[PDB]
Nucleic acid binder design. Sequence first.
RNA 1: GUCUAGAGGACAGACGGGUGUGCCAAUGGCCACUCAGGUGGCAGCCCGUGGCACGAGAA
Length: 1011
Amino acid sequence: AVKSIKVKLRLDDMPEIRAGLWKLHKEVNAGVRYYTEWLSLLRQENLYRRSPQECDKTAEECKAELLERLRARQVENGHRGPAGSDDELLQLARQLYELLVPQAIGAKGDAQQIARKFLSPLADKDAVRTADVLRALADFGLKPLMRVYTDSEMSSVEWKPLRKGQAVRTWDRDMFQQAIERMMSWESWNQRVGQEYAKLVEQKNRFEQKNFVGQEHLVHLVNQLQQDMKEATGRALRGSDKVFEKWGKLAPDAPFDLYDAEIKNVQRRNTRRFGSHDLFAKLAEPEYQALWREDASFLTRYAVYNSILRKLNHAKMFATFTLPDATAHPIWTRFDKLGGNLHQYTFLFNEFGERRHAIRFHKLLKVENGVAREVDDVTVPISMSEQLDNLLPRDPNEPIALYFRDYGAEQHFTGEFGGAKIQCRRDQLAHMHGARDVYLNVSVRVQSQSEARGERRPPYAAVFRLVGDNHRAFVHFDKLSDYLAEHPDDGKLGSEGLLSGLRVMSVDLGLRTSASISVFRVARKDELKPNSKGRVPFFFPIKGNDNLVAVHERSQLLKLPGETESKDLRAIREERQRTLRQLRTQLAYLRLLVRCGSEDVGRRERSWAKLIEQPVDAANHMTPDWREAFENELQKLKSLHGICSDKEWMDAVYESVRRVWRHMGKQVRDWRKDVRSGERPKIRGYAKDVVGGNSIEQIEYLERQYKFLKSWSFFGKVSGQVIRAEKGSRFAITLREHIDHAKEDRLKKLADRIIMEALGYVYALDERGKGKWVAKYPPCQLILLEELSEYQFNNDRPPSENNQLMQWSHRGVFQELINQAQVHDLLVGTMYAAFSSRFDARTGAPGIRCRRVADDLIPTGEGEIFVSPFSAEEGDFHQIHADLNAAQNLQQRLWSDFDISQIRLRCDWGEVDGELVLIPRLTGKRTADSYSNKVFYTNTGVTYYEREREKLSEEEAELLVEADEAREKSVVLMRDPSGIINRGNWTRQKEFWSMVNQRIEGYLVKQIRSR
RNA sequence: GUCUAGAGGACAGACGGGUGUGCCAAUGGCCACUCAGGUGGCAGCCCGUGGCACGAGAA
């Protein structure tokens, strides 16, 4: 529970110090640059890499450079020999590196310890299995090995004098330790990035091994195709099933025009979604063997290989090396909490007033009149912050003791100041050499109540395993009965009630509603379990106990402010984007006209034909003045179409395109000026319904702007007026920042949102006035997240649910959850979520979603409410909210010890007894436990029956398997627990879901009855 | 009214003081050099009916 509080030093009156701060900074960095340069040098090896990747130093260059330093060193401390063989001296240097960085050889080390131990023999003449290394070193005349930076030429600074036969000032220590700490990190980072590349190469190389199977020629053909295309695949190639089915009728040695026509046929059926015409058109020629000759699958299979192939192409072998620079690569001056050894500081409460604090620096430095000398005790004011107002001091006599305070949470925590770092914006750093803002980053160590009670881990972590970090969750089932009596039920409802009862909250993440949470309490069945106000509660059996069951307390929908829906609201939302929708629709055709330019042929005709007369330029969404202007240049192109020569035509477009490009620039310029600075209504206080943030829609909307501007500009460079070299600077530096902070702010609030609920505090507006957290319900020990991908499973969640934002959001929340959750001891756990939205809890049988993403009723589409068959086969249909039910599923999965082996099975054809069978993918038990030496067979080929007899790489399991799917090689089976859908047998996957559609699609369609 | 999870339920109806980081309709203004976008130089908002969060560090 280290929280970091950054504060701004009002280093305003004293510019004697401000320069000092800056001088410190530059100075520390030089120190670290010194040692760190020694260390990089200090391994006899190894090639050092720096991208502009090019390797800055070999190999020998490090070795040749190091010897000189050493031999120069031997000369500096008078040596009467021996001076080691160069070769053997090198070994010692290597041996020393490793002790200095244990991580280099995959071991462990503490920079605090290794700095404490090693500096004095290294940097000191002592006068005014490591010990082999040091004794060996002095034998060779290399003590001290390295200069001490502050007591040196390099430092332009007058420090406080050195006495008492100590050769190292405190700072020489901090700089050394930083230098080690840094290498230790770098060494483990370089090893990881180097490894990932090989696993990419090795895993990629599998796909080449299994899939292409001695048919090089096809591969070469596409290689040859791609270059044909770039001369003057991915998942563009959307209609290949259909385009390729139809072509089969057509003949090789046949006219192309017949081929082009089929592409046009599928474009209309499948528009919007179609692969580039050009890819297909290119396909049409005598090169159609790639489609033409089985496998047909090959391009679709290949497209994946190209996915992987790029990734290694875009992935790097070595972690690049840069030495710190004050300005380019800053590292920060570091301090220590009062006590402990090195430079220290003291937080002063209310030093200059109430709520006005300051920081006393034992050992700050200051420059006067261009002379930089050291100073002893300095206090610096500090801008008042809300964050500071939170913390408190427990004992004046022992400083560094603070009460860290949370209100609602009803806890008051205890703790201490850790050490600080002084740092500024990285934007300013180039500027500094001048009033540039400076902050102090101060760590804060906070003791959870469990940490305070002296408990090593809280009482209930005994009962819940977690794993993989990526915490997985499993319950210990014996221990629930034990546990509960020791900690039985209570009124206690705050942070207080943590010991008292056992509770789990399950949270599902979704775009419309940020979290849907489910709370279940564990109580004995056949006790008061029947006692319910009014109706009996809903529950789940637990695997361990026949008198223990999980009672559901409440299920809720947690929404960030932006979530609410309304007529007034929807209106405002569509206005916001109206211009942007138009501008993107305008550019699309502006980019189309360019296509008319060709040069390469075929492109010119296809592009030309579509634009002019079919159906027409789109009135529906364009901005009108453009609509006219386009129609103008549109007529103009037509008149001159037969008449003009190829140049007259090509150069007519260029000039024609300029005409519309320029007009847009005013629209763009106009619009950016409005969004960038304009009147808009901005809320005050708390407004229940608000317009965008913190929703995904709002975040999305800001991205979309950025990602348009990147294209408006990019267009100009490709075709149109501009040609310019691209400088390092990226787009929309202001916007990029905004967005990222929106995003930061989103998920931090999303944690606190989820985190408050577990503790069962609700935020009640009245008066609002003041709305304050008031505790409501007893707290929940454990929090259940769901798991993340890759990969995206067929028939679990629409893609609408899956986009970089959702993935990013998932990742962000988990992290902030485990981080936020720490202070008050809440476990954070995850549960496989696959088909947690597809099946019921607890029929529980497969379903579909309805009605909506007159007054509508019952229609079926993805989102937002689940419906399923019950008990069974009409029977009846059971209706449930969609994301509420995913959460409830998570709970069932916990309590019953779910493994996905229960529902799904990946397997491929092999023959065991002169019979073809599906033989499972055994990785990894429970699946292995259940299904080892079981084998599946069919008579139908749709429904399957079971007869008797180290790497998991899940991310890569589906990918190798989806292609196996493309051939007949692999089949997936899925099964209903309920026995409703197929009699409960394993059914091939695709049929299984259709049977599911037909089952509910049918009653619903039928219920309509008469016209 | 409909639906199950029985619940915050989902769906319909002038003076004085401050300015740690950001979000919430929340992406500063002006001029000059090479419609977007950089690069260089110059000079609002809250509090005494405004809300919300916040470990940071490195890439």
